[PDB]
Design an enzyme around this catalytic site. Structure first.
Site, PDB file in Angstrom:
ATOM      1  N   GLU A   1      -8.869   4.347   1.975  1.00  0.00           N
ATOM      2  CA  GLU A   1      -7.532   4.882   2.040  1.00  0.00           C
ATOM      3  C   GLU A   1      -7.471   6.392   1.788  1.00  0.00           C
ATOM      4  OE1 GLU A   1      -3.769   3.382  -0.626  1.00  0.00           O
ATOM      5  OE2 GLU A   1      -5.491   3.945  -1.835  1.00  0.00           O
TER       6      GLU A   1
ATOM      7  N   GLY B   1      -8.402   6.053  -8.720  1.00  0.00           N
ATOM      8  CA  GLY B   1      -8.554   6.589  -7.379  1.00  0.00           C
ATOM      9  C   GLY B   1      -8.203   5.700  -6.198  1.00  0.00           C
ATOM     10  N   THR B   2      -8.368   6.273  -5.007  1.00  0.00           N
ATOM     11  CA  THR B   2      -8.126   5.623  -3.721  1.00  0.00           C
ATOM     12  C   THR B   2      -8.860   4.279  -3.618  1.00  0.00           C
ATOM     13  OG1 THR B   2      -7.578   7.508  -2.268  1.00  0.00           O
ATOM     14  CG2 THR B   2      -9.074   5.787  -1.371  1.00  0.00           C
ATOM     15  N   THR B   3      -8.398   3.411  -2.746  1.00  0.00           N
ATOM     16  CA  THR B   3      -9.063   2.144  -2.619  1.00  0.00           C
ATOM     17  C   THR B   3      -9.992   2.195  -1.413  1.00  0.00           C
ATOM     18  OG1 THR B   3      -8.706  -0.266  -2.527  1.00  0.00           O
ATOM     19  CG2 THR B   3      -7.142   1.129  -1.335  1.00  0.00           C
TER      20      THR B   3
END
Ligand SMILES: [Mg+2]
Ligand SMILES: [Mg+2]
Ligand SMILES: [Mg+2]
Ligand SMILES: [Mg+2]
Lengths: 102, 246, 238, 230, 240, 230, 242, 235, 233
Positions: free
Chosen positions: G45, G28-30
């Site tokens: 993000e 997933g997104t950071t």
């Protein structure tokens, strides 16, 4: 002891003409000898060409009216926007009231 | 997991029970010898390191002032079983008749616990076997052995766990129906010695008996109907005193 | 846990397998006459040294005018019976009229049906032949129920091992124009059918007759034997 | 029983639908003069009394339904359907809408708080003032569709196809009667007589009426004649 | 047979066994010893990532005013045991009128583990718990429990991957001294002894941010801070 | 092996069942959603099983100020809309406040999630486009059974949705500015739904449109009334 | 077979289903957090899958009570769940103790809840990792929680795909500013670190999101970075990005 | 609690197997009493047979049952048996008719058969009982929950063997003293061990002594078994 | 089914052309003992609502807690928490009314009388009452307890009907409210001299005055009164 009930006076009158009907009500709201408000409607339009008034103890009048208006909403839901006929509305209210028979 | 974990296999065996019996088989040996005026049950205090403290592990326990229990198998499963045993002793009995239950009855109750483990949904049998010794006004002295199946039966003497067979054998030769307590103790000690691997003394052995009443262990003088508990655990010193007479 | 479930082919195995247990059970049959219904059954013979006096018989009274017989796990039946008996009284108590054979049937059927779509319960290993007469009526009733919950009426029908064979006997020996118009002949017919499978046996067969207005009676080992004999005769006379 | 397939379908539901394909053909056709519901009896022997086969039931005076599949499963569904029409009459002093009724039934369907889906489908036909004559098919999935004509059960594939051909927005009650009869005949393994097929219809004036064998026979016959024309 | 706590054909509980391995996942070693009137438990502290707030890394817990517990095992399972150990300790006081004794608390905790051992739906907790305190009746105390439901008291003990080496070291000391406790009046020294004998067995020098010390005296259990430890570490760099 | 339930993550960290559920959506008719700064339209291409049935209703009103279009397992849509109706209702009754679309979204997500973390359950297998006008303007939300909800100027979901999704992905600058005129917004809504067609042209039974905005309460236009949009 | 059911210990004492959950997280997104001198900043993000997304609307950071900020990476929905429970757990604390929940306390509450989902095979662990924190009676606190229910306190923390790049950047900050870091600084810094970390996902245009809880900049309450203050950091990142 | 493709209940079938490995119990119904005899499983010189009760249990003063299977499973079923007995007595003030008690016990077993998911009980029972409606009766219940009544019957180890021996020597007009003998004989020939000895037996009768009116249940004491043995000549 | 213990008296309020004013003393009485003197009974909710409560205090303190949570919980996942989707006086009222009506319908009431005074986002003044029975009403002026008997008559002299509201300045209204509060100090035995007043105007926003005192009291005449009839000196 706590008394869950009260009286807010008021008076209503419904008359049905050959092709119309009226539901009239005074506007005063009171408690004992004091006037709580000179203007607090008590006869409402519930949608579907239906006017209703629940006169007596304002809280209960309020609740009932709400439950009914709402009952109209759901009726439309569960029955593809079918108009609620006055007699149907009537039988419904019987049930609302009677649900609190105790 | 609301279904029985212990089911019937096509040969007609209850898998989990036999396995529990296996676990029992690997446990340290314990014995019970019933004399005429007493019963003794003993085991070995298998210290898993000399850093641990021997006393803080009662392998032998008082269930009522006249009933003790020793086991073979998984200690934890035993520990909780003793708790429940002492409890039911009161609930199903002392709180109804004002006296502690008789050995066979308590034994019967304990059994009931283990059976439930054999059939209730989502659990495994207890991995223990107990030798329960006690006395009661009407049935006198008795010794019982209880299994993970729930099965229980009385004995004149017996042993369970590791050296059960060898031990049972030795017991079978020395036991007779005219044994005075000291002697059965003697025999218990003797029987114990052969299954014990290392040091055999008052700190590696655990003997408890069920015999005459001990007023000195009551805690009060006054009421004379109850003269004291019959269950008495042996002291390191008392055990050795006897060992020295090997 | 859902035991009775559908399979890739549209079957509820447990229900289907339930039927197998029905087949393994002895035979039971019932044919309805013109003013009566009879139900016959063959007795189990795995071990013999039985005390006939007490042993749970195969035909049971649901009420004074309704009976039920079955083929299947003997245990599973008892339950169906109790639930039916209790419902028989309840109907009386609240409707002030005893059950009609149909109603009783539909009751028993629904019970079974229920066990086919309820978790943690295996279907009933049983099929029942329920018969009797409606209150204040004379038209005989014979109904059949299966583990699926399906039920219906029959002029004559049978269930249990070899039911197919005897069913056939009936399919041609019972004409819906002259139903066995006498207790005697209806019995005959049932016996005849029963013989085709029972395998020459007196105590092997038990026959129960049901007439209007709570008139029910099981024939004794010997009353039956008499029929057996007269039947082996209308066989040997050729 | 609530597991999805890699294709995105509910197994037990798909299978449930297969069990239905094994059941007696049920057909309903919806006109402007009514809705006909006809079914195929299918007796597992000639000893069985053909009349004790109930596959077309009255839900309420203005609503009837035909069933197909594991019929016993349908008992609870009818019960519920009836109770609901009634209850709706009690609380509102009026006739429940066919759709609502149906929806009520389906609402029951997906409640997989009963070990498995229902192994049966229904043809609910009825009439109400606001939406006229209506035909609905109810599946164990919990889904339901309105059709002008529909067949379900063993012979549904051919039947549906034939319906597709025979139906037009202007048949008469009699016509449809015949078709159901016809199509029933076309897909029945046994020969169509009055003891193995059952017709019913529902009209504004007289409501849900199940045809008495005699009336049906008269139509069966009327059919054999109209068919043996060319 | 190897997924839930039922018995294996040899009469074993595999899941219980594997839970014992998870106790080593952390790679920390600890030890406890009893003084004349106190108890010490040292545990290595290992803070890897630089982004961590060193102060929040601990495997030593304050269960109650008098009971301190050190865990060898993953943190989730560890904290789970703590909360419960804490709760139980309180309840005990409310209902019985005096503070829960460390041994009783150990027994109670052990019994709870046994249950995971016997019921299939509960997985054992992969951790080992050493409870230390100076009991009003018993004196300095150390009781340790494991995923099998076993629990017992120790003169001294150790836990971790290098458990065996530590134990032998201690076993030797007490075998030489003849007593079951460090013969020192102040906890400071016991802590010292403790760390000395830890270094002696692991073959590693320690800095202040590499240890975790917990001490328990009459009526209280506390964890030393880096500085406090340092005062120890310094004093030891005089005998050795 | 790893696709038996939703309580099982695969070795790559996926929830197959959820994923399989998402695939249930792709086998449903396309439904488009698009909004301007004053209106929100829902154009849903309805589907038919045979040429004698109904084109399944894809649009459900949840309150006088909000509604949704579904694509997938109808039952689930009913369950989800109903839950949405209740929560809208609760806001009205208890706070005399119209439920914020974003808020409704937060609700559906939370509801779906519970069915993607517990044994015995099954993710919902239906997607929904929710439009609604409130105190902060027009809104369009896309809901996926994984539990993910996103606010968009426009979109579509179902079989071949990707066609309309690009149309809107380019036509944005054009429709985001269709304020004061609903007809256009709808036209766009149709024009979008057509870039995901193939079977045939959208018909008078095919189409289903829902609009809501500034001075327009959630209204369902079905059949006849959409004629002027083909 | 030790990886099919949750509560199962493998022969090496690992709970595989947990580790798999971790994978969902990684995919997933950071997101990150930087404990600063008197507060903490959160940033994440938001990947812009299409022009069709309404800008600056699908907020992902969340607040618990009024002083805790929460951001997580993974199966988004699982995050929300973790937060709702956080909210219930925080209310319950306030109702009974009056003072809003202390971060250490709160974390542990979230901890115990997640850990619970690794105890029964009837449940799957959480497919997300959460970074959260805030200000309380005695300092700022930043924590990160992993699917195993494991959590610790941080100087800086990050997670998701750009995790390593981000951690690298954070590591720099810790060694270069042991004194602390003004909230303003940490803001821009996070903006940067996210921009940087975005490179491990350098294929789609993104939308930054930052929030902070500072004792001098937001009175100890959790507020979102918007307007002038947000743009400033967006540009500060676009600057040092080359 | 599921069905096999053949139409059998696995766990039930398997249960019956477990049972066949259990000691033998026999119940022989005479004209003036009923006998129950049972050979004990696993013994030793050290087992105390004096104070033992593992196969013969008293249910009510008029009903006794012999057990074949898991002792523990048995006791559970028994206790509830003893209870239903008393409930009936309280409710009606008449002792419970044997079949009623038996049918009730059966119904429980059947329950385990049909629902729940619990393993059936590994037990079979022989009920020896008396009642004013049918006098002496002999019953048997097994795991499927099925029950039936007999003139003589056995359960446990070597049924066919013993069943065949009984069917041979039994005759409608028997007398207790004879049934006792028969029982012993049968056990004697169907044992799996050296020779029948008192220490391996459990014996009990239900007679209605002519010099009175109420039925007397006598559970034989070890010595009496040793005695009844010498007389019959097993020595 | 309870009985109030520590209590607060009247809360008066009225609406003027651009907003609303509400006021209440700062007394918590334990029967006849004026026990607590520092009790604020006007609870501002946000920047547009003030809830005045009389009756049982413990119950009021609870309603406080409840209002705060309402605020907190409204912030949650609400990016417009301080704008379009902030709490309107009307929302707060309805919540309260509903609670009151439920507690009474379960016979465990919130022993109170509450006035919610505020101004809606679009400008409309909002004034509505609800009591332990779930009874609700609105009017140009509203007052609970004695205020109802004494204060309303005075306030109604300024605003008798709706049409009078747009003709009333804050100066006027505020003056009225203050005088009323003075009357009540004279005639209500449970009143207190110190009070609190709050105005919610559609422009200036919320103004909350704390620590006001009744001043300009006429008492001098008490000297010319002796005896209760015939006493001359
Ligand atoms: Mg109507
Ligand atoms: Mg890492
Ligand atoms: Mg377990
Ligand atoms: Mg488990």
């Amino acid at each position: 002891q706590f008394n869950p009930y009260g009286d807010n006076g008021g008076t209503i009158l419904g008359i049905a003409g050959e092709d119309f009907a009226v539901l009239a009500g005074d506007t005063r709201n009171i408690t004992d000898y004091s006037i709580n408000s000179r203007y607090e409607p008590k006869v409402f339009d519930c949608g579907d060409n239906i006017v209703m008034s629940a006169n007596g103890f304002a809280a209960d009048g309020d609740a009932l009216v709400k439950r009914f208006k709402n009952s109209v909403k759901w009726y439309h839901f569960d029955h593809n926007d079918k108009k609620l006929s006055i007699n149907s509305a009537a039988r419904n209210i019987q049930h609302l009231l009677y649900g609190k028979r105790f | 997991y609301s279904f029985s974990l212990t089911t019937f296999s096509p040969s007609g065996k209850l898998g989990q029970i036999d396995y529990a019996l296996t676990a029992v088989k690997q446990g340290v040996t314990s014995l019970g010898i019933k004399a005429t005026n007493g019963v003794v049950i003993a085991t070995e205090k298998k210290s898993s390191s000399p850093l641990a403290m021997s006393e803080t592990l009662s392998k032998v326990s008082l269930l009522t002032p006249d009933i003790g229990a020793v086991y073979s198998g998984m200690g934890p499963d035993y520990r909780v079983l003793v708790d429940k045993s002492r409890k039911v002793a009161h609930t199903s009995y002392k709180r109804i008749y004002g006296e502690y239950p008789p050995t066979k009855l308590l034994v019967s109750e304990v059994a009931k616990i283990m059976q439930e483990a054999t059939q209730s949904g989502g659990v495994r049998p207890f991995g223990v076997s107990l030798l329960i010794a006690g006395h009661d006004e009407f049935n006198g002295f008795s010794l019982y052995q209880v299994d993970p199946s729930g099965s229980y039966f009385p004995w004149k003497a017996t042993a369970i766990g590791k050296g059960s067979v060898a031990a049972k054998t030795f017991l079978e030769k020395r036991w007779n129906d005219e044994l005075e307590l000291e002697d059965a103790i003697h025999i218990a000690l003797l029987t114990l010695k052969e299954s014990v691997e290392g040091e055999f003394n008052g700190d590696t052995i655990e003997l408890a008996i069920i015999g005459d009443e001990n007023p000195d262990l009551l805690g009060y003088t006054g009421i004379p109907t109850d003269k004291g508990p019959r269950f008495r655990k042996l002291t390191s010193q008392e055990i050795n005193d006897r060992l020295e007479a090997l | 846990r859902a035991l009775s479930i559908f399979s890739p082919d549209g079957h509820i195995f447990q229900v289907e397998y339930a039927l197998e247990a029905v087949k393994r059970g002895t035979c039971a049959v019932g044919v309805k006459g013109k003013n009566c219904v009879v139900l016959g059954c063959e007795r189990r013979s795995t071990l013999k040294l039985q005390d006939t006096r007490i042993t749970p018989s195969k035909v049971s009274k649901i009420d004074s005018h309704v009976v039920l017989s079955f083929s299947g796990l003997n245990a599973d039946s008892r339950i169906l019976i109790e639930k039916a008996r209790v419902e028989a009284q309840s109907h009386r108590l609240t409707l002030e009229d005893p059950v009609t054979v149909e109603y009783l049937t539909r009751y028993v059927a629904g019970v079974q049906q229920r066990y086919t779509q309820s978790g943690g319960v295996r279907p009933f290993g049983v099929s029942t032949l329920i018969a009797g007469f409606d209150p204040r009526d004379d038209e005989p009733k014979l109904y059949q129920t299966e583990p699926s919950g399906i039920y219906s009426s029959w002029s004559a029908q049978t269930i249990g091992r070899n039911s197919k064979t005897v069913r056939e006997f009936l399919e041609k020996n019972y004409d819906r124009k002259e139903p066995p118009a006498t207790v005697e002949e209806c019995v005959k017919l049932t016996v005849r059918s029963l013989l085709e499978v029972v395998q020459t046996g007196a105590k092997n067969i038990e026959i129960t007759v049901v007439k209007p207005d709570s008139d029910i009676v099981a024939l004794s080992s010997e009353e039956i034997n008499q029929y057996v004999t007269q039947i082996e005769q209308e066989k040997q006379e050729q | 029983v609530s597991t999805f397939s890699p294709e995105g379908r509910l197994f037990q539901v798909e299978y449930s639908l297969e069990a239905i394909k094994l059941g007696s053909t049920a057909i309903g056709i919806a006109t402007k003069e009514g809705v006909v519901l006809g079914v195929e009896k299918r007796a597992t022997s000639p000893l069985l009394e053909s009349d004790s086969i109930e596959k077309i039931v009255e839900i309420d005076r203005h609503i009837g339904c035909a069933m197909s599949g594991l019929t016993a499963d349908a008992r609870s569904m009818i019960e519920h359907a009836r109770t609901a029409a009634v209850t709706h009459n009690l609380y509102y002093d009026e006739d429940i809408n066919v759709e609502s009724l149906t929806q009520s039934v389906c609402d029951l369907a997906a409640a997989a708080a009963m070990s498995r889906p229902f192994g049966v489908a229904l043809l609910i036909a009825g009439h109400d003032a606001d939406d006229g004559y209506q035909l609905f098919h109810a599946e164990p999935s919990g889904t339901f569709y309105r059709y002008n004509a529909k067949a379900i059960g063993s012979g549904s594939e051919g039947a549906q196809a034939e319906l597709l051909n025979e139906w037009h927005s202007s048949l008469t009650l009699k016509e449809a009667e015949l078709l159901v009869l016809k199509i029933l005949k076309q897909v029945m393994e046994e020969k169509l007589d009055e003891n193995n097929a059952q017709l019913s219809c529902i009209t504004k004036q007289d409501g849900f009426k199940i045809y008495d064998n005699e009336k049906t026979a008269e139509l069966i016959k009327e059919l054999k004649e109209k068919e043996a024309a060319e | 047979d190897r997924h839930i706590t039922i018995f294996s054909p040899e009469g074993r509980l595999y899941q219980v066994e594997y839970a014992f391995k998870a106790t080593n996942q952390t790679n920390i070693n600890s030890l406890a010893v009893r003084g004349k009137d106190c108890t010490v438990v040292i545990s290595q502290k290992k803070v890897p990532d630089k982004l961590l707030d060193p102060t929040t890394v601990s495997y030593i817990f304050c269960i109650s005013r008098t009971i301190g517990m050190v865990v060898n095992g993953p943190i989730p399972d560890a904290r789970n045991a703590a909360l419960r150990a804490k709760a139980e300790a309180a309840e005990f006081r409310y209902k019985y009128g005096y503070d829960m004794p460390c041994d009783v608390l150990a027994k109670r905790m052990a019994n709870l583990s046994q249950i995971y051992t016997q019921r299939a739906y509960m997985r054992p907790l992969g951790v080992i718990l050493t409870f230390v305190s100076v009991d009003e009746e018993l004196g300095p105390s150390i009781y340790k429990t494991d995923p099998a439901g076993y629990y017992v008291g120790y003169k001294a003990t150790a836990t971790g991957p290098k458990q065996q080496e530590i134990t032998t070291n201690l076993e030797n000391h007490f075998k030489k001294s003849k007593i079951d406790h460090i013969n020192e009046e102040s906890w400071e020294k016991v802590v010292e002894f403790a760390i000395t004998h830890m270094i002696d067995a692991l073959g590693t020098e320690f800095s202040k941010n590499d240890l975790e010390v917990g001490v328990a005296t009459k009526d209280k259990f506390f964890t030393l801070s880096a500085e406090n430890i340092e005062e120890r570490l310094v004093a030891i760099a005089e005998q050795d | 092996n790893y696709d038996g339930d939703t309580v099982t993550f695969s070795p790559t960290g996926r929830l197959f069942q959820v994923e399989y559920a998402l695939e249930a959506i792709k086998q449903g008719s396309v439904t488009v959603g698009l909004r301007s700064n004053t209106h929100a339209v829902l154009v849903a291409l309805k589907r038919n099983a045979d040429e004698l049935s109904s084109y399944q209703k894809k649009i459900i009103k949840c309150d006088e100020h909000m509604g949704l279009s579904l694509a997938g397992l109808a039952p689930d849509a009913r369950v989800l809309s109903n839950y949405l109706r209740q929560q809208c209702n609760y806001s009205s009754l208890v706070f005399n406040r119209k439920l914020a679309v974003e808020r409704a979204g937060h609700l559906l997500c939370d509801k779906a999630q519970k069915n993607t973390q517990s044994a015995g359950g099954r993710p919902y297998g239906v997607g929904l486009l929710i439009i609604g006008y409130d105190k902060s303007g027009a809104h369009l939300l896309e809901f996926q059974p994984s539990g993910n909800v996103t606010e968009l100027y426009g979109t579509a979901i179902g079989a071949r949705s990707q066609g309309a999704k690009t149309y809107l992905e380019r036509t944005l600058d054009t429709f985001i500015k269709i304020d004061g005129n609903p007809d256009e917004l709808i036209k766009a809504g149709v024009e979008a739904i057509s870039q995901s067609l193939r079977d045939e042209s959208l018909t008078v039974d095919n189409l289903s449109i829902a609009i809501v905005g500034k001075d327009t309460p959630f209204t369902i236009y079905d059949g006849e009334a959409v004629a002027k949009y083909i | 077979g030790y990886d099919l059911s949750n509560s199962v210990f493998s022969p090496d004492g690992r709970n595989f289903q947990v580790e798999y959950a971790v994978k969902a997280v990684e995919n997933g997104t950071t997101s990150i957090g930087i404990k600063c001198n008197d507060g903490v900043v959160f940033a994440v993000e938001k990947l812009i899958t299409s022009k069709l997304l309404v800008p600056q609307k699908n907020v992902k950071i969340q607040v618990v009570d009024r002083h805790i900020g929460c951001v997580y990476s993974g199966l988004i929905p699982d995050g929300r769940h973790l937060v709702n429970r956080g909210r219930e757990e925080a209310a319950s604390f306030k109702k009974l103790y009056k003072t809003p929940i202390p971060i250490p306390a709160f974390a542990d509450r979230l901890g115990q809840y997640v850990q619970a989902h690794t105890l029964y095979n009837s449940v799957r662990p959480f497919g997300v990792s959460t970074i959260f924190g805030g200000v309380d009676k005695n300092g700022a606190h930043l924590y990160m929680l992993e699917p195993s229910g494991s959590y610790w306190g941080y100087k800086g923390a990050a997670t998701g795909k750009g995790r390593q790049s981000a951690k690298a950047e954070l590591e720099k900050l810790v060694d270069h500013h042991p004194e602390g870091l003004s909230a303003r600084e940490a803001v821009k810094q996070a903006a940067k670190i996210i921009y940087l970390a975005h490179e491990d996902n350098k294929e789609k245009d993104f939308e930054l999101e930052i929030s902070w809880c500072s004792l001098s900049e937001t009175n100890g309450l959790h507020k979102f970075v918007k307007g002038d203050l947000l743009q400033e950091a967006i540009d500060f990142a676009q600057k040092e990005i080359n | 609690t599921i069905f096999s493709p053949e139409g059998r209940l696995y766990q039930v079938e398997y249960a019956l197997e477990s049972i066949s490995h259990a000691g033998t119990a026999i119940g022989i119904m005479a004209s003036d009493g009923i006998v129950l005899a049972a050979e004990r499983k696993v013994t030793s010189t050290l087992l105390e047979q004096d104070t033992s009760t593992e196969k013969l249990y008293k249910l009510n003063d008029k009903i006794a049952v012999a057990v074949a299977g898991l002792t523990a499973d048995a006791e559970i079923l028994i206790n509830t048996a003893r209870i239903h007995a008393q409930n009936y007595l309280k409710t009606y003030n008449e002792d419970i008719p044997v079949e009623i008690l038996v049918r009730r016990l059966s119904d429980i077993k059947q329950g385990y058969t049909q629902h729940g998911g619990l393993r059936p009980f590994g037990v079979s029972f022989i009920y020896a009982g008396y009642d004013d409606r049918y006098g002496y009766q002999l019953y048997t219940s097994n795991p499927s929950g099925n029950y039936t009544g007999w003139k003589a019957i056995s359960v446990g180890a070597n049924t066919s063997a013993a069943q065949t021996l009984l069917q041979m020597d039994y005759k409608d007009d028997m007398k207790v003293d004879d049934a006792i003998e028969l029982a012993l004989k049968t056990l004697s020939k169907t044992t799996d061990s050296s020779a029948l000895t008192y220490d391996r037996l459990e014996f009990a009768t239900i007679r209605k002594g002519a010099n009175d009116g109420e039925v007397y249940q006598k559970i034989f004491k070890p010595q009496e078994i040793k005695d009844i043995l010498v007389k019959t000549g097993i020595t | 089914t309870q009985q109030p213990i520590v209590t607060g008296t009247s809360v008066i309020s009225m609406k003027y052309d651009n907003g609303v004013i509400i006021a209440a003393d700062n007394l918590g009485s334990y029967g006849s003992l004026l026990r607590f003197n520092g009790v604020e009974r006007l609870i501002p909710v946000g920047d547009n609502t003030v809830v005045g409560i009389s009756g049982d205090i413990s119950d009021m303190q609870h309603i406080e807690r409840l209002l705060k949570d309402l605020v907190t919980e409204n912030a949650y996942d609400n990016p417009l928490a301080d704008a379009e989707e902030a709490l309107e006086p009307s929302y707060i009222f309805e919540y309260l009314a509903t609670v009151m009506y439920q507690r009474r319908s379960k016979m465990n009431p919130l022993w109170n009388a509450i006035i919610v005074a505020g101004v809606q986002s679009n400008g409309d003044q909002f004034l509505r009452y609800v009591n332990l029975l779930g009874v609700t009403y609105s009017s140009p002026t509203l007052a609970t307890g004695f205020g109802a008997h004494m204060a309303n008559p005075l306030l109604r002299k300024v605003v008798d009907r709706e049409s009078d509201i747009p003709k009333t300045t804050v100066q006027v209204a505020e003056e009225a409210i203050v005088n009323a509060m003075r009357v009540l100090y004279y005639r209500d035995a449970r009143s207190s001299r110190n009070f609190s007043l709050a105005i919610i105007d559609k422009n200036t926003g919320l103004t909350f005055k704390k620590n006001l005192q009744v001043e300009n009291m006429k008492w001098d005449f008490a000297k010319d009164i002796k005896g209760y009839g015939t006493q001359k000196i």
